[PDB]
Design a protein around this ligand. Structure first.
Ligand SMILES: OCc1cc(C(F)(F)F)ccc1N1CCOCC1
Length: 284
C-alpha cells in the first residue's frame, strides 16, 4: 500500500498512537546481560536503554570491552550504522576509541549539549583550534581543524590521532542543531537537507566503517535518521518503490537495538520525511 495513502488514512482516523503501540508489541526482545553487569553502571546514561548482547559494539581491550552502542546491519539496503548514547564524562575516551577501532569516517549528532536546562551529553569535541583534547585512558588526541556553521546544522573537520602509532585520520562531525526541545520539526525539509549532506560526504559509503549516530539515548532522533536513510535507499533499488513498508523496516532495525522511534509523533515525522524525500528521489 503506497505509504502516502496509508499516511492520509492514519491521519484522518487519528490512529498514530494505535499503530505505534502495535510496533512496540511486535518488537524483538533479546538479552542485554553485559549492559546490566554492576561494573558497567556508570557506562549507561539511562537504566532502560541497553544494547543487545548479540549486536553490541566491543571495545578492543581486555580490561572492560563494554560501550552502550549497537551495530544496525541492513542486508537488502547494503548500509550499516552504529547507534550510540550521547557520551558521558567517564565514556568520552571509549567513544573515540570506538570511532578509531570501527574505521568510521563520520559522527552524526542530533542533540544539543544542553536541552530543557539539563546536560544531554558531554562536551566531547574541542571548540577551539589551539585547545586540543587528549583522552589519557584510551591514548587518543583530537584537534578541531575547521568549522562551517549554517542555519540548521554545523559541519566540523576533526583530526583523530592514535598516540600509540602516531597514525592520524580525518573525522567529519555532522551536528544537527535545530531539533526542538519538545515534539518534532513541523517540516522535514531541513532534516532531509542534512541527511543529503551526510550522504554527499562519503560517511555512509561502504569504503568506510559504519557512521556513528547519536542523540541523548541513541534511539529516538537517531532511529529517525537511519530509518529515513534506509527507506529512501530501498525506494531507489527496487522496481516497485511502493513495496517499501516503513513499519516492516523499523521492526527489522529493532532486531539490532531496542526502542528505535520513541513516540507516535517521531513515527509520523519519519513517514513525512520518507514521503517528501522520495519526491527529491523520483526525478525531482
Ligand atoms: O536527490 C535526493 C535528495 C535531494 C535533496 C534536495 F532536493 F534538496 F537537493 C535532498 C535530499 C535527498 N535525499 C537524501 C535524504 O532525503 C531524501 C533523499
Amino acid at each position: 500500500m503506497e505509504m502516502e495513502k496509508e499516511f492520509e488514512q492514519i491521519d484522518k482516523s487519528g490512529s498514530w498512537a494505535a499503530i505505534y503501540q502495535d510496533i512496540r508489541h511486535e518488537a524483538s526482545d533479546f538479552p542485554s546481560r553485559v549492559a546490566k553487569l554492576p561494573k558497567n553502571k556508570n557506562r549507561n546514561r539511562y537504566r532502560d536503554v541497553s544494547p543487545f548482547d548479540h549486536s553490541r559494539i566491543k571495545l578492543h581491550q581486555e580490561d572492560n570491552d563494554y560501550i552502550n552502542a549497537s551495530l544496525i546491519k541492513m542486508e537488502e539496503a547494503q548500509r550499516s550504522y552504529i547507534l550510540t548514547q550521547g557520551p558521558l564524562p567517564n565514556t568520552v575516551g571509549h567513544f573515540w576509541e570506538m570511532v578509531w577501532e570501527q574505521k568510521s569516517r563520520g559522527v552524526v549528532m542530533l542533540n544539543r549539549v544542553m536541552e530543557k536546562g539539563s546536560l544531554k551529553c558531554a562536551q566531547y569535541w574541542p571548540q577551539k583550534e589551539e585547545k586540543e583534547m587528549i583522552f589519557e585512558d584510551t591514548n587518543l588526541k583530537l584537534t578541531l581543524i575547521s568549522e562551517d556553521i549554517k542555519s540548521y546544522y554545523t559541519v566540523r573537520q576533526l583530526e583523530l590521532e592514535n598516540l600509540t602509532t602516531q597514525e592520524t585520520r580525518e573525522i567529519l562531525h555532522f551536528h544537527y542543531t535545530t531539533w526542538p526541545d519538545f515534539g518534532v520539526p513541523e517540516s522535514p525539509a531541513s532534516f532531509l537537507n542534512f541527511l543529503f549532506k551526510v550522504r554527499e560526504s562519503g560517511s555512509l559509503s561502504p569504503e568506510h566503517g559504519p557512521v556513528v549516530v547519536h542523540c541523548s539515548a541513541g534511539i529516538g532522533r537517531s532511529g529517525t535518521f537511519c530509518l529515513a536513510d534506509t527507506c529512501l535507499l530501498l525506494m531507489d533499488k527496487r522496481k516497485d518503490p511502493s513495496s517499501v513498508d516503513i513499519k516492516k523496516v523499523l521492526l527489522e532495525m529493532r532486531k539490532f537495538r531496542m526502542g528505535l522511534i520513541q513516540t507516535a509523533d517521531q513515527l509520523r515525522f519519519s513517514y513525512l520525511a520518507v514521503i517528501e524525500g522520495a519526491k527529491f528521489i523520483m526525478g525531482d
